[PDB]
Structure formats: C-alpha cells, structure tokens
Amino acid sequence: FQNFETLQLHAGYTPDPHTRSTAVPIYATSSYTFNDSAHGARLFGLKELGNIYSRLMNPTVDVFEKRIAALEGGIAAAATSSGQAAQFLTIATLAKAGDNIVASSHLYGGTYNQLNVLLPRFGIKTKFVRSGKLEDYAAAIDDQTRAIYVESMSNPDYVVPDFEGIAKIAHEHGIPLVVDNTLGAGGYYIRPIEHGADIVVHSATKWIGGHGTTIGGVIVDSGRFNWNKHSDRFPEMVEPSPSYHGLKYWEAFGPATFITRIRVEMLRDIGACLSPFSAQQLLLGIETLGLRAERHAQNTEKLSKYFESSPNVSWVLWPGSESHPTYSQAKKYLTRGFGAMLSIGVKGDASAGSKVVDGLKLVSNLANVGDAKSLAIHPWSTTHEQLSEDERLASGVTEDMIRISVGIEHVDDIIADFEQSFQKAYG
Amino acid sequence: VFQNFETLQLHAGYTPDPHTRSTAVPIYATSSYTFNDSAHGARLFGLKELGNIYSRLMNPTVDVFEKRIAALEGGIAAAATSSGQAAQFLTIATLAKAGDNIVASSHLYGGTYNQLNVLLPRFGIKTKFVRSGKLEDYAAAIDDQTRAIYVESMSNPDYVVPDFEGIAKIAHEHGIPLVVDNTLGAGGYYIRPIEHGADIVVHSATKWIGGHGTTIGGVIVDSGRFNWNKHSDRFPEMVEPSPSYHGLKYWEAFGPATFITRIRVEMLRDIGACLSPFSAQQLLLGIETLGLRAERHAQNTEKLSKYFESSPNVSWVLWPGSESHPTYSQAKKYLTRGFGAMLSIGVKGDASAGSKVVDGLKLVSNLANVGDAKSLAIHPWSTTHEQLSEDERLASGVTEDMIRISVGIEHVDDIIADFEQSFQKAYG
Ligand SMILES: C=C/C(=N\Cc1c(COP(=O)(O)O)cnc(C)c1O)C(=O)O
Numbered sequence: 001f002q003n004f005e006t007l008q009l010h011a012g013y014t015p016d017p018h019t020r021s022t023a024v025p026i027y028a029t030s031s032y033t034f035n036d037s038a039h040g041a042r043l044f045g046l047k048e049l050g051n052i053y054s055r056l057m058n059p060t061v062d063v064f065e066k067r068i069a070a071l072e073g074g075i076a077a078a079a080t081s082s083g084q085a086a087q088f089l090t091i092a093t094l095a096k097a098g099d100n101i102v103a104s105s106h107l108y109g110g111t112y113n114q115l116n117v118l119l120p121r122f123g124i125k126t127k128f129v130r131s132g133k134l135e136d137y138a139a140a141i142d143d144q145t146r147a148i149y150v151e152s153m154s155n156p157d158y159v160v161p162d163f164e165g166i167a168k169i170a171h172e173h174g175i176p177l178v179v180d181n182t183l184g185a186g187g188y189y190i191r192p193i194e195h196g197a198d199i200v201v202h203s204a205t206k207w208i209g210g211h212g213t214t215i216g217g218v219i220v221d222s223g224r225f226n227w228n229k230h231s232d233r234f235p236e237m238v239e240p241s242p243s244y245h246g247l248k249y250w251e252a253f254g255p256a257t258f259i260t261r262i263r264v265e266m267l268r269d270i271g272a273c274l275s276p277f278s279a280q281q282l283l284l285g286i287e288t289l290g291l292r293a294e295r296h297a298q299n300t301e302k303l304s305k306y307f308e309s310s311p312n313v314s315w316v317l318w319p320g321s322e323s324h325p326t327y328s329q330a331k332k333y334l335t336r337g338f339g340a341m342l343s344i345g346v347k348g349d350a351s352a353g354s355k356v357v358d359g360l361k362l363v364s365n366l367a368n369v370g371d372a373k374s375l376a377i378h379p380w381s382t383t384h385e386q387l388s389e390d391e392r393l394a395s396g397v398t399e400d401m402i403r404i405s406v407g408i409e410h411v412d413d414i415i416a417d418f419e420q421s422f423q424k425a426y427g
Numbered sequence: 428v429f430q431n432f433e434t435l436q437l438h439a440g441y442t443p444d445p446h447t448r449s450t451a452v453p454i455y456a457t458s459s460y461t462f463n464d465s466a467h468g469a470r471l472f473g474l475k476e477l478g479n480i481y482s483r484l485m486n487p488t489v490d491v492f493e494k495r496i497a498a499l500e501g502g503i504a505a506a507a508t509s510s511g512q513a514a515q516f517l518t519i520a521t522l523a524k525a526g527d528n529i530v531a532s533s534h535l536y537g538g539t540y541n542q543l544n545v546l547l548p549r550f551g552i553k554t555k556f557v558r559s560g561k562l563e564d565y566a567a568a569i570d571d572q573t574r575a576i577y578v579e580s581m582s583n584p585d586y587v588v589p590d591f592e593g594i595a596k597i598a599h600e601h602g603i604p605l606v607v608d609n610t611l612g613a614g615g616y617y618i619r620p621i622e623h624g625a626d627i628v629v630h631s632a633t634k635w636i637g638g639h640g641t642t643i644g645g646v647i648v649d650s651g652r653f654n655w656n657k658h659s660d661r662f663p664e665m666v667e668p669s670p671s672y673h674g675l676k677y678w679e680a681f682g683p684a685t686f687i688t689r690i691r692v693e694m695l696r697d698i699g700a701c702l703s704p705f706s707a708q709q710l711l712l713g714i715e716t717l718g719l720r721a722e723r724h725a726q727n728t729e730k731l732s733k734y735f736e737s738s739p740n741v742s743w744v745l746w747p748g749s750e751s752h753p754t755y756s757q758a759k760k761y762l763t764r765g766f767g768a769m770l771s772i773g774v775k776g777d778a779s780a781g782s783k784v785v786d787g788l789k790l791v792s793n794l795a796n797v798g799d800a801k802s803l804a805i806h807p808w809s810t811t812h813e814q815l816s817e818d819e820r821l822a823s824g825v826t827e828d829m830i831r832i833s834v835g836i837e838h839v840d841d842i843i844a845d846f847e848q849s850f851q852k853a854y855g
C-alpha cells in the first residue's frame with residue numbers, strides 16, 4: 001500500500017496466529033523467555049533476531065517503529081522516550097567529542113539549548129546558520145562536521161528549508177542531512193526522505209500521538225546514506241566495534257547500520273526507551289493521523305483568513321501565506337496542506353498578547369503542539385525562555401509573538417473564541 | 428513521618444487530592460498541564476514557582492514514585508528515568524563532562540561496565556577501574572579531574588559488598604561524592620547506602636522495586652548530604668551562574684537539592700529519558716509489597732543455598748551470606764535484614780553442564796532480568812556480560828561455569844524440586 005491513510009492502520013502488524021488479536025497488544029513485559037541457553041547466547045551475540053529485553057525492543061514498540069518508518073518512507077525506525085532523546089541519541093551516534101554539526105538557528109527552544117549548552121560539555125559543538133542560504137551552510141562545514149540538522153518547519157516561525165539544495169551540499173561533503181519533521185505530522189505534510197534527508201526525527205508527543213496523552217520520540221533511518229563510502233567521517237560505522245568483539249556494522253547490516261547502532265549501542269547504554277503503554281497510546285493516534293492532519297490544516301487556513309482581516313491582529317505568520325519569507329519552499333514541499341500552526345501579533349502594548357490568550361475559553365494555554373485541542377503559548381517566555389534575546393530573534397521569536405496550534409474543533413468555535421476574547425481586550 | 432519501610436512503601440508521597448479523593452494513585456496520561464494564565468506559565472518556565480509544566484520533566488504519577496523511593500532510601504528527593512541505564516547516564520553526565528573521569532569498582536553489571544568503558548569515553552568522560560576493593564587503590568586512582576567514586580551495593584553477579592564507610596571517607600576527603608547503584612539492595616530493603624556515607628543512589632526499578640517483570644525504569648536518589656559549595660573547585664556548575672537559566676546559581680537557590688534539581692531542569696529537560704506514568708503506576712503496585720517480597724526472596728535464597736551446598740551436582744555456591752564469601756565481613760556489617768535475593772552456582776562436569784541444568788528447568792525461567800517474583804536463571808558469560816573481554820569478565824567475577832539465579836517467591840520446595848528433577852536428567 002502506498003497511501004498514507006492505509007499504511008497508518010495496517011503497516012507493521014499482522015495478528016499473531018496464537019491469539020489472532022486484531023488490535024496491537026500491550027506487551028507489558030521487561031523480558032522474553034529464551035527457548036534454551038543456546039538461543040539466549042545467539043540473541044546476545046547478535047547472531048539471531050529476537051526479543052531479549054524491553055530496554056532494547058518490545059513488540060508493541062516494534063509496531064509503532066515499523067508504522068512510522070513506513071509512513072515516512074524509511075527502512076526502519078527506533079523509538080525513544082521523548083523527542084529530545086531522539087535528537088540526542090541521533091547526534092550521539094553520528095558525533096563524538098571533538099566533532100561538530102551544522103544546524104539551522106531556527107529551532108524549538110529545547111533543541112537549541114541541547115545543541116548550544118548540553119552537547120558542548122560532551123565535546124560536541126554546533127555551528128548555527130541563520131540565513132537559510134546554501135552558501136552559508138556550505139561555508140560552515142569543516143572536516144569535523146558530522147551532520148546538517150534542520151527542522152522541516154521551524155518552531156515557531158515556520159521556516160521551510162531548501163531540502164534538496166541543502167541535501168546536495170551535505171552529500172557532496174559526505175555528511176548526512178538530519179531533519180526534525182515534528183511539524184510535518186509524521187510525514188503527512190512533508191516527507192523529507194523524498195527530498196534528500198538521510199535521517200528523520202520526531203517528537204511523537206505532538207501530531208503523531210495527537211491527543212496530548214503521551215511523551216515519545218522516534219528516529220527514522222532512510223537507509224540511503226552509504227556510510228562505507230564516507231567512512232573517513234564515520235569510522236565507527238565500518239571499523240571493528242569495541243562493544244561487540246570487533247563486529248563490523250556496515251559489513252553485517254548495510255543500509256540498516258545507523259538504526260542498528262541506535263538500538264544495540266545507544267538504547268542499550270543510554271537507555272532512553274519507550275514504554276509499550278506509551279506506544280499503544282501513540283498507535284491509537286497514528287490510526288487517524290491523516291484525517292486529523294487534514295482537518296488541522298483546513299482549520300489553520302480558515303483561521304488565518306479570519307486573522308488576516310481582523311483589525312485586532314497586527315500580523316499573521318503562516319507558511320501558506322504568499323508573504324511568508326520561505327513561501328517559495330513551502331509551495332514546493334507542502335502539497336497536502338500548509339501545516340497545523342500559525343503565529344500572530346495583536347495590536348496594543350506588551351500587555352495585549354497575554355490579555356488575548358488569558359481571555360480565551362476554548363483554546364488552552366499550555367506547552368504542547370499538535371493536540372486535537374487548540375492551544376496557544378507565548379514562546380518568548382516559555383518554549384524559548386532559555387535563549388538570549390538575540391538567540392530568540394535568530395529563531396524568529398519576538399516578544400509580541402503568540403504561537404497557535406490549531407485544533408480540530410469546529411473552526412467557527414475557534415474563531416468565535418478569539419472574537420469574544422478580542423472584544424473583552426479591545427471593545 | 429513514618430518509621431518503618433513496610434508503612435512507607437504504601438503511604439509515602441501521596442495524599443488523595445480533594446477534587447476526586449482517589450485513594451489509589453491516578454495515572455496522569457497527559458503530556459501537558461494547562462496554565463492558570465499567561466503570567467503563571469512564565470513563572471513556571473522561569474523556575475519562579477513550583478508546578479506541573481510538561482511530562483518530559485514532571486508528572487504527578489511519577490512524582491509519587493519518586494517521593495516514595497526517596498523516603499524508602501532516606502534521601503531528600505529522587506528523579507525517575509526511563510531505565511536503570513538512564514539513571515546512571517544522567518547522574519554521571521551531571522557530575523562530569525569531557526575531560527573528567529570517575530573511579531569505579533570493576534565489579535559491575537555488564538551493561539554498566541560497557542557504559543563506563545565504551546560509551547562515556549566517546550564524550551570524553553573516562554573511568555578508572557579498581558579491581559581489588561582495597562581502600563588504598565581507590566584513593567590512588569583519584570586525580571584532580573575525578574568526579575565520583577561509583578560502586579554497586581552488591582555486585583552483579585558475584586555479590587561483592589563494598590566497604591561503604593571506608594570508601595565514603597576516601598571520597599569525601601577528596602571532595603567527590605560516593606555514587607552507589609543499590610539495585611540489588613531491593614529499594615533500600617536489604618541495604619541503605621545513604622546511611623553509610625553514600626551521596627547519590629541509583630536503581631534499576633526494573634528489578635525488585637517493580638518486582639513483576641512488567642516494566643523498565645530507573646530512579647536517582649539525592650541524599651542532600653554532599654555540600655556542593657564546599658567543593659565548587661570540582662563542581663563549578665553547581666555554584667556558578669548557569670548558561671541554561673540566565674545566570675541562575677543553583678546552590679544559592681536550591682541548597683541541598685542542587686544535584687537533583689539539575690537532573691530535572693537540565694538532564695531530563697535536554698536528554699529526555701523520562702518515565703511514563705503508566706510505567707510509574709506498574710512500579711507503584713510493586714513497591715506496595717516490596718518489603719514482603721524482599722523478605723521472602725531472602726528467606727528462599729538462604730534455604731536454596733543450603734540445598735545447593737549439600738548437592739552432589741554443585742561445584743560451588745556463591746552467596747553473600749556465606750562465611751566463605753570474599754566480602755562476608757562487609758555483608759555481615761551492612762546486610763542485617765537478609766542476605767539478598769541472588770545466588771550463583773557452578774555445576775559439576777564439563778562445559779556444557781550448566782547449560783543442560785538450566786535448559787532442564789521447568790519452573791525457573793531462563794531470561795535476562797533479576798528481581799522478578801518468578802525465579803530466574805541465566806549464564807552471564809554469554810549474556811549480561813557478553814560484551815566484556817574475558818579478562819574484564821574475571822575482573823567482574825564472571826566465570827564461564829557461572830549460573831546466576833534470581834531466587835523468586837515461589838514455594839521453596841517447588842524451586843528445589845525443579846533443580847532436583849533437572850539434576851537427575853543432566854546427571855542420572
Ligand atoms: C513542549 C514542547 C514543545 N516542543 C517539543 C519539540 C521537541 C522535543 O520533543 P519532546 O522531547 O517534547 O517529545 C522536538 N522538536 C520539536 C520541533 C518540538 O516542538 C513545544 O510545545 O514547543
């Protein structure tokens with residue numbers, strides 16, 4: 001099947017012949033009993049594929065991994081306990097002390113802090129690029145570079161990168177392109193592997209889960225980056241491995257080498273694993289991902305038209321807008337809806353934004369995106385609080401910005417909620 | 428304020444909320460927590476007010492799990508993680524950075540040894556291993572870049588018990604904390620290392636704490652007893668203006684809670700190895716019977732060691748309650764509520780015999796875990812310690828003839844009977 005709406009219900013699971021359970025069971029088990037002692041030794045020796053221990057694999061999580069990989073067009077995936085952990089495990093596999101990665105400066109505030117503050121005390125530095133220009137990405141690469149890292153639509157100014165031009169630069173220098181596709185809704189709005197991304201990461205907490213119940217992340221491997229070809233930057237992908245008695249990953253696993261290392265090195269030793277309970281919550285969300293993402297983007301388009309005519313709004317920021325700075329990229333890469341987000345500024349002083357948010361009765365003020373319920377937050381004092389004012393500006397965040405995650409409520413009710421709040425704030 | 432472990436494991440850290448009056452701990456399957464207003468959200472994010480923000484960082488179900496474990500161990504506070512490995516990783520990553528080292532015992536669970544010997548050096552954090560257990564070797568390995576001494580309260584799978592008070596004395600005299608993995612101490616039932624000088628205790632909650640083999644999880648417990656200010660030369664991030672929080676000075680704001688606070692507002696926030704509330708609820712169900720289970724585990728282990736000691740089919744028994752145990756003097760001193768839930772044996776004959784004995788068991792399960800209510804057996808040489816070199820396995824007490832047994836709470840006569848019938852089959 002290659003329709004998204006079909007894969008999100010069927011990919012990665014067949015009822016086992018023992019129980020024939022139609023729905024995916026929740027394998028609430030830490031462990032898996034060996035057939036015999038020799039079988040256990042083959043499992044720990046990576047000589048036979050099979051369930052060993054839920055810090056590394058779990059059959060509920062396996063369905064979640066296979067289904068997200070199918071939706072994104074990757075070969076395989078690995079779940080983590082959060083979007084933050086998905087990014088951390090990915091960079092930790094590609095880079096070590098003395099390496100760097102090149103990243104867009106337009107990031108979720110928590111990713112910016114991860115790259116700018118946390119990773120450097122492990123020896124891993126980031127060179128940020130603000131302009132989006134191909135030549136500035138090229139000029140930032142040096143011999144210690146291990147990836148280019150961008151968000152598919154930055155949180156919360158919705159910069160769409162030139163995926164194909166950046167992938168070309170990355171690949172000419174022998175480094176992978178890593179894309180955080182959280183705001184791409186599990187591949188529905190944007191499938192970065194189709195435009196050159198080698199590795200895709202998600203906070204599954206957001207549109208993938210869809211209901212604000214569960215934290216989770218996932219790492220998708222395209223299988224398309226020839227590590228052996230570029231083993232001067234990635235020796236651990238081909239050289240004998242100190243943690244598996246000289247196993248050579250590329251020779252053993254080929255295009256699955258990166259995602260194999262994520263599991264047998266990083267999940268095994270860092271241990272940021274996903275619960276099967278969490279995975280089942282996320283699978284329920286995935287079963288309607290296409291439907292929700294479609295309605296989200298329809299409501300977002302309609303709500304932006306309302307905001308564009310509202311005398312109470314000073315500006316609307318929406319990647320579907322012909323005024324958007326990267327509208328030419330949005331137009332090329334987003335052909336199934338221009339996302340589920342918009343940001344606005346409202347008229348008046350510094351006080352006005354908080355007054356409009358606080359007066360909403362349907363929209364919830366909290367930290368999340370991609371709930372079925374509509375959400376609002378002030379990134380300058382929350383999601384991007386840890387950044388300096390200059391860093392906020394380099395990420396498109398300003399003191400007057402209100403970030404809106406548009407839900408699937410009836411759009412007349414969303415609009416009516418803003419209307420009554422505007423009339424309490426302004427008359 | 429309660430005295431007894433048995434009472435704390437049911438009541439510490441939870442009072443029914445007055446909205447619902449729910450007697451049992453609810454499962455807060457929520458990513459987020461709605462602000463009262465915009466200014467409230469700003470105070471939460473600015474760390475100006477205590478309150479729920481987002482479940483990568485805090486969650487009310489996980490919070491009960493955390494407080495209850497802290498109360499059982501005698502710490503001021505705890506932070507849950509997605510696994511025992513993650514509890515270790517986040518702890519060392521807070522204390523140390525690239526260019527630093529820690530000193531650790533060489534008697535470790537194989538996954539920890541590989542974490543310290545292979546993973547962390549990639550981040551420029553190296554470990555100096557001490558094989559002897561002697562106080563003077565721990566002292567000698569400390570240099571100016573050392574950031575901790577790390578030991579298991581009873582090592583997996585040879586059950587070395589460390590001289591807690593002597594090692595703690597060395598650590599504190601050099602201005603570094605003592606970090607103890609108390610996994611095999613069963614949540615503080617068998618051993619409470621904070622009472623003996625440990626500054627920080629980590630657990631795999633996957634084991635006796637959860638007790639049913641359903642759930643992976645970890646937890647970090649801060650004693651609150653290490654003075655980060657006295658030793659800001661080795662730990663400047665504990666006192667110096669913080670780049671994550673606009674110059675916040677942690678010690679000056681949080682005092683004895685500084686380490687556990689950084690674990691949350693730096694490591695869980697940016698590494699994100701959080702525990703789900705569904706997992707915390709499974710673990711809370713286990714904790715409600717931890718003292719009862721640990722008591723029966725140890726009672727069954729004592730009786731099973733008696734059985735193996737009189738069996739013609741056993742070459743040796745390894746049990747920290749044995750007067751022949753290399754660290755029996757430390758076990759007797761620090762284990763006064765039962766000598767653990769574990770033993771290891773070697774069986775007579777050639778190399779294939781341990782394998783046939785385990786394969787012949789029909790009640791005991793051959794799998795990777797410890798601290799299930801069900802009895803378990805495994806061959807660590809080819810499993811839990813498979814990643815280590817042979818010399819590294821010896822230095823951790825693992826032999827090729829070792830069978831590790833996690834003794835369950837089944838009726839001990841059924842456990843003995845299972846080994847007996849498997850012994851006839853293997854040996855006639
Ligand atoms: C409250 C968190 C928010 N965003 C999280 C996020 C993450 C991290 O994922 P988690 O660790 O939270 O699962 C990664 N990438 C992007 C694009 C993100 O927006 C938000 O509301 O802005």
Ligand SMILES: C=C/C(=N\Cc1c(COP(=O)(O)O)cnc(C)c1O)C(=O)O
Nearest residue numbers: 510511512536610631633795796797811
């Ligand atoms: C299958 C795993 C086993 N042990 C795990 C373990 C860990 C890691 O914790 P998790 O990441 O597994 O929660 C930490 N410390 C000790 C002492 C441990 O024994 C085992 O069966 O030997």
